[PDB]
Amino acid sequence: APDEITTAWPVNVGPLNPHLYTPNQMFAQSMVYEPLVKYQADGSVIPWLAKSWTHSEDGKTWTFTLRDDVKFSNGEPFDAEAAAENFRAVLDNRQRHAWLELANQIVDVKALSKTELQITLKSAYYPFLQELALPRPFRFIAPSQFKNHETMNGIKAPIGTGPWILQESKLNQYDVFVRNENYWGEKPAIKKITFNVIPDPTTRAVAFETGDIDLLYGNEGLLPLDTFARFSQNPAYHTQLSQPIETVMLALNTAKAPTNELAVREALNYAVNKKSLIDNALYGTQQVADTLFAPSVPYANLGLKPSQYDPQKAKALLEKAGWTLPAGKDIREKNGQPLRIELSFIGTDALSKSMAEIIQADMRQIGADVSLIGEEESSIYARQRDGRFGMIFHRTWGAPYDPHAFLSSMRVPSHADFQAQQGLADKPLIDKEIGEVLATHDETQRQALYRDILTRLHDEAVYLPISYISMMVVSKPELGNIPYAPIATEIPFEQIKP
Ligand SMILES: O=C(O)CN(CCN(CC(=O)O)CC(=O)O)CC(=O)O
Ligand SMILES: [Fe+3]
Numbered sequence: 001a002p003d004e005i006t007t008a009w010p011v012n013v014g015p016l017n018p019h020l021y022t023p024n025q026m027f028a029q030s031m032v033y034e035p036l037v038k039y040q041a042d043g044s045v046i047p048w049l050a051k052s053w054t055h056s057e058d059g060k061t062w063t064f065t066l067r068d069d070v071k072f073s074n075g076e077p078f079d080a081e082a083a084a085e086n087f088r089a090v091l092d093n094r095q096r097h098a099w100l101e102l103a104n105q106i107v108d109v110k111a112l113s114k115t116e117l118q119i120t121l122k123s124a125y126y127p128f129l130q131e132l133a134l135p136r137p138f139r140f141i142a143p144s145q146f147k148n149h150e151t152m153n154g155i156k157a158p159i160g161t162g163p164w165i166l167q168e169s170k171l172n173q174y175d176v177f178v179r180n181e182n183y184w185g186e187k188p189a190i191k192k193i194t195f196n197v198i199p200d201p202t203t204r205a206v207a208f209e210t211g212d213i214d215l216l217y218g219n220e221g222l223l224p225l226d227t228f229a230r231f232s233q234n235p236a237y238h239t240q241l242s243q244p245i246e247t248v249m250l251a252l253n254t255a256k257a258p259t260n261e262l263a264v265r266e267a268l269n270y271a272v273n274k275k276s277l278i279d280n281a282l283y284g285t286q287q288v289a290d291t292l293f294a295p296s297v298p299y300a301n302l303g304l305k306p307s308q309y310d311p312q313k314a315k316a317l318l319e320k321a322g323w324t325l326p327a328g329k330d331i332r333e334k335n336g337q338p339l340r341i342e343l344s345f346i347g348t349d350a351l352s353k354s355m356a357e358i359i360q361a362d363m364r365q366i367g368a369d370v371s372l373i374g375e376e377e378s379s380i381y382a383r384q385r386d387g388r389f390g391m392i393f394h395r396t397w398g399a400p401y402d403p404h405a406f407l408s409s410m411r412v413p414s415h416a417d418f419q420a421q422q423g424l425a426d427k428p429l430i431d432k433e434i435g436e437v438l439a440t441h442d443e444t445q446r447q448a449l450y451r452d453i454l455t456r457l458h459d460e461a462v463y464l465p466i467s468y469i470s471m472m473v474v475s476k477p478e479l480g481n482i483p484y485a486p487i488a489t490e491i492p493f494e495q496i497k498p
Contacts, residue, residue, distance in 0.1 A: 002498060004192040005479065007215040008207060010199045013175045016158035016166055019090045019137045019151045026135040027491040028195075031177060032073075032160035033139035036064055036083070036117075036132050039400050041486040043298060045129045049078065049140070049161065050117070059124030059441060064117040070184045072142040074159045080111030085143040086151075087119070093152035099409040101438055102131035102138070123439040126446070130400040135489055163188050163494045172197055188494040201350070202227075208237075208474055216474040217482065217491050220248070220467075221351055223474065225283040231474050238475045238482075244468035245488045246398040247289050250343075250359070250391045251416050251463055255423030258339055259390055263321035264368075265461035268341075268391075269307040270314035271366045272359055278467055281354040285472075289465035291458060297402050299450040304458045314366040325367055332367035340369045342390040344383050347374025352393055355466070359391075387419030391464070394420075398488025407434050407453060420462055430456055 014024035018033040037045035037053075050064040070078035087109035090097065097103030105128075108120040121128065132138050141151065142159040158166050163183045167176040175195040179188050196213060198204050205223040207213045208231075216222055232239040252259045252268065259265055274288045287294075290306030318324075323332040323339050332339040343359060345352040353374060360370040370391075375383075383389045394416050396402050410417040411431045421427050430453055437449040457463065473482045483495040 001192075002478070003190055004194075005190060005214045005496075006194045006196060006212070007217065008198045008204050008213050009175070009195045010197070012169055012171055012197055013166075013195060015155065015169075017151060017155045018139045018141045018158075018160065019086075019093065021096075021136070024136070026489040028166075028175070028177075029139070030135040030162075030487070030490045031164040031493065032158055032162045032166060033135075033141065034160060034162045035134070035139050036066075037129050039130060039133035039486050041399075043130075043400070045133050049083070060121045062119045062121070062128070063112070064119070066115045066117060067184065068115055070161050071182060072159050072161055073165050073180050073182065074142055074144070074157070075182075076142050076144060076159075078140065078161050079114045080117040081114070082143050083117050083140055084109050084111040085146070086140045087138070089146060089151040090137045092150060096152070097137060099412050099415065100131060100134075100137075100405065101125065101408045102128060124441050125439060126441065127404045127438060131405070133400060133487070135487065164193070167192075186494070189497045190493060193493055205231075205474075214476045215479060215482070217471070219245075219471060220282060220286060220469045221349070222472050225281075225285050225351075228285065228472060228474070229283050236477075238473075238477045238479070240473035240475075240482060241285060242471035242484045244287055244294060244470050246402060246469060247292060247294065247396040247465055248286075248467045248469050249289065249292065249394055249396075249463045249465040251389075251394045251420040252391050252461065253387060253389055253420055253423070254460070254462060255387065255419075256390060258323075258334075258337070259341060260423050261321060262461060263317050264323070264339070266307070267314040267317040267321075267366060268363065268368070269461050269464055270310040270317070271368065272362045272464065272466070273309040274466055275309070277355060277358045277362075281351065281358055282467065286470060287468040289468050292454065292463050292465055293396065293403050294468045299403055299447060300454060302451055302454055304455065307461075311362075311366050318367060323367070330364065330367060331369045338369055339367060340371060342371045342373050344373045344375065344380055344389045344392045346377050346380050346393075348376070355393075384416035384419065385414045387422060389416075389419075392416060392420075394463075395469075400487060403450065403454070404438060407450075408438060410434060421457075424456075424460055424462070426456055426460075 013028035036050040038048040053064045055062045105121045105125045110118050112118050145156040145159050147154045163180050164177045165180050167178045169175045177193045179191045201223045205227045231237045252265050278286050291304050293300035295301045323334045345356050356372050363370045397406050409415050433449050433453050440446050480498050483492050485492040
């Protein structure tokens with residue numbers, strides 16, 4: 001069947017509530033649900049469910065003109081009432097969306113007619129349109145499928161306007177999607193997509209080698225990277241590696257001994273041989289990261305000075321800070337206290353473990369004792385939210401989140417970044433400036449504020465950037481060239497064209 005494919009995902013796609021997070025998978029929410037405006041790789045948006053829009057001079061009131069020809073997959077019309085009901089349903093759960101500042105800025109949403117939708121904002125929020133473009137939460141389910149006139153407590157059928165329809169889901173086995181034959185836009189070439197639930201990366205590679213699946217698409221965790229490199233040379237297969245999409249880093253706890261000392265954080269940022277780490281654990285497949293955001297990220301080409309691998313310098317910094325080696329020991333001490341740092345990661349994630357072992361080795365060579373704390377996912381996320389870590393693996397979010405949304409979220413205390421930053425004298429100023437940068441319409445001031453925030457974060461050595469990672473593809477050749485989505489968390493199945 002040349003227009004049916006089988007792929008894999010580590011978990012089910014979830015219930016496909018458009019307005020909720022885990023266990024809903026973003027790429028799948030994006031398959032069914034659509035936005036008012038669609039994000040493009042150049043950073044702009046184009047008309048989508050909204051054909052056009054205007055705003056007020058003060059930038060607080062926006063009026064969208066909607067398409068008039070869009071139906072939900074169940075035949076019900078998409079109109080301004082439906083869109084307004086969705087916004088209400090999202091904002092009824094406002095607390096859950098704190099990380100996204102548009103959810104705090106929207107003050108009112110109302111359908112002025114079937115085709116006119118008015119959105120009012122607290123302030124002149126510059127990332128407005130890009131945040132409407134996101135996979136979640138501002139996309140649209142048929143209001144008939146609300147439960148008790150809400151979505152925050154669940155939905156009935158996951159009815160969107162999008163090019164794919166969920167056919168069926170079987171927990172821990174598979175999810176099947178079919179093409180929407182009444183889609184308002186271009187019809188996908190592919191008719192059916194089956195997602196086999198395959199949690200282990202090795203098991204995913206095996207499934208591809210046996211012919212059980214036709215396509216694997218995902219980030220650096222998709223399959224073992226040595227196997228990837230092998231497949232890349234195998235003439236029976238097709239593989240791809242995108243340009244980098246986001247940063248993988250450690251976050252260092254500025255509020256916990258001994259990472260509360262700037263000098264210790266500086267030393268750590270000279271201690272890791274990142275090129276080696278990438279060649280060893282990532283099989284040469286990713287790029288070295290010197291800064292939180294790659295220089296290609298909007299607002300982030302700042303000429304920030306890299307801390308290159310330099311164990312001599314790391315040891316000098318620590319000696320100067322009073323962290324010195326006792327007679328016959330390899331671990332430094334200050335005030336009888338050992339230089340001991342806990343590194344938390346997801347313990348069943350083989351790649352993270354491999355990286356953690358490398359980081360531990362490199363840091364031992366400069367007299368820091370890194371203890372590896374590998375735990376289940378829920379325990380790691382809990383550590384991130386409450387700052388119970390020394391160092392922790394973390395990542396940025398990709399386009400169109402990076403940098404404005406990721407920075408916005410640094411203000412939210414129940415996220416790793418806030419927690420890592422909590423010990424900085426200038427954290428309140430950073431948070432103030434993050435608030436300002438998002439509202440400011442003076443473009444000169446906006447660049448200054450991004451420079452200031454990112455520069456403080458860099459100079460304070462809050463992070464240990466490791467790698468700018470890429471999306472990876474393995475496919476049967478008959479599927480052809482597999483496109484990448486502008487939005488880093490989306491999978492553009494509708495663009496596959498054998
Ligand atoms: O996952 C969440 O609950 C919310 N996200 C907000 C950022 N997300 C977008 C999302 O979940 O909608 C980025 C991402 O998950 O890549 C927090 C996080 O991932 O750290
Ligand atoms: Fe998220």
